[PDB]
Amino acid sequence: MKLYIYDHCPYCLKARMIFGLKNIPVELHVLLNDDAETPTRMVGQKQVPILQKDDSRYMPESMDIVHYVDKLDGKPLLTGKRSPAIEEWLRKVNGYANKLLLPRFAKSAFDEFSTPAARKYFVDKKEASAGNFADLLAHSDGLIKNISDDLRALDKLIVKPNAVNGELSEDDIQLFPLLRNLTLVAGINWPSRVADYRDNMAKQTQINLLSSMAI
Ligand SMILES: N[C@@H](CCC(=O)N[C@@H](CS)C(=O)NCC(=O)O)C(=O)O
């Protein structure tokens, strides 16, 4: 199997998580952010992630990829219950986290931005949809306060460091990518159960945190 991604893309992280949790090899390939030709040839639209199955078929959609991979060996791991409280929290934080993440992604040394044109493509598309990056960065301290406050609420919902609801579930798939990407945001106050879950799930999934790149 092969997986076509951007390193910053949370949907790509979801797909990467199931390969890491099950110790399944996969050939990761980062596409440039301005590359429409490759994904459109594969799945008829420009988006990532894209899985190539062993028989050469290409398949988009992070949660279809997660479901497919988790069933291959007949022993799915994502058997635990989801939590309405976690869904509510993610609904709230996914409503604004991009205001912190997008301007920081755009400055950072991710492979999908390795040409000037690919980085500029991201900046121009995302300033159009999310707003002027200088203005988003001007509001960093208020947005960091908001994240830190919301992380204190999440802290009470982290049942175990290895699984947000106590048994591995799709809520780990939905939550970890956001926490991983938030480690790029210098200044966040991380509560202890959230921090332990972040670190434990990074190890289980073999996905790097971005703490060393934080800005
Ligand atoms: N529903 C898709 C969402 C994927 C997605 O929105 N990926 C973003 C990158 S994070 C992307 O491909 N946007 C279009 C682009 O980069 O041209 C999934 O779950 O895989």
Atom index in ligand 1 nearest the CA of residue 8 equals: 10
Q: Please state, as a whole number, how many other Cβ atoms lie within 10 Å of the Cβ of residue 94.
A: 12
Per the CB < 8 A criterion, the answer to whether 201 and 77 are in contact is no
> What is the C-alpha separation between 150 and 85, in angstroms, rounded?
12
Query: How close is the Cα of 211 to the center of ligand 1, in Å?
Result: 24
Strands 58-60, 50-52: pairing kind: antiparallel
Query: How close is the Cα of 47 to the center of ligand 1, in Å?
Result: 5
CA nearest ligand 1 atom 9, residue: 9
How would you class 194 by CB atoms within 10 Å of its CB: exposed for 0-12, middle for 13-18, buried for 19 or more?
Answer: buried
Residues in the chain: 215
Query: How close is the Cα of 173 to the center of ligand 1, in Å?
Result: 16
CA nearest ligand 1 atom 16, residue: 47
- Residue 160's beta-bridge partner residues? 163
- Residue 29's beta-bridge partner residues? 4
Ligand 1 cavity residues, CB under 6 Å = 6, 9, 11, 33, 46-49, 60-63
> What is the C-alpha separation between 185 and 27, in angstroms, rounded?
28
Prior bond of 49 cis (ω within 30°)? yes
> What is the C-alpha separation between 170 and 76, in angstroms, rounded?
11
> What is the C-alpha separation between 2 and 185, in angstroms, rounded?
30
CA nearest ligand 1 atom 11, residue: 47
Query: How close is the Cα of 5 to the center of ligand 1, in Å?
Result: 9
> Number of helices and strands (H, E) in the chain?
10, 4
Query: How close is the Cα of 11 to the center of ligand 1, in Å?
Result: 7
Helix (H) or strand (E) holding 197: helix 192-205
- Residue 28's beta-bridge partner residues? 3
Pocket test for ligand 1, best of 8, 47, 101 (most atoms within 8 A of CB): 47
Query: How close is the Cα of 156 to the center of ligand 1, in Å?
Result: 30
Strands ordered across the beta sheet of 2-5: 27-30, 2-5, 50-52, 58-60
CA nearest ligand 1 atom 15, residue: 47
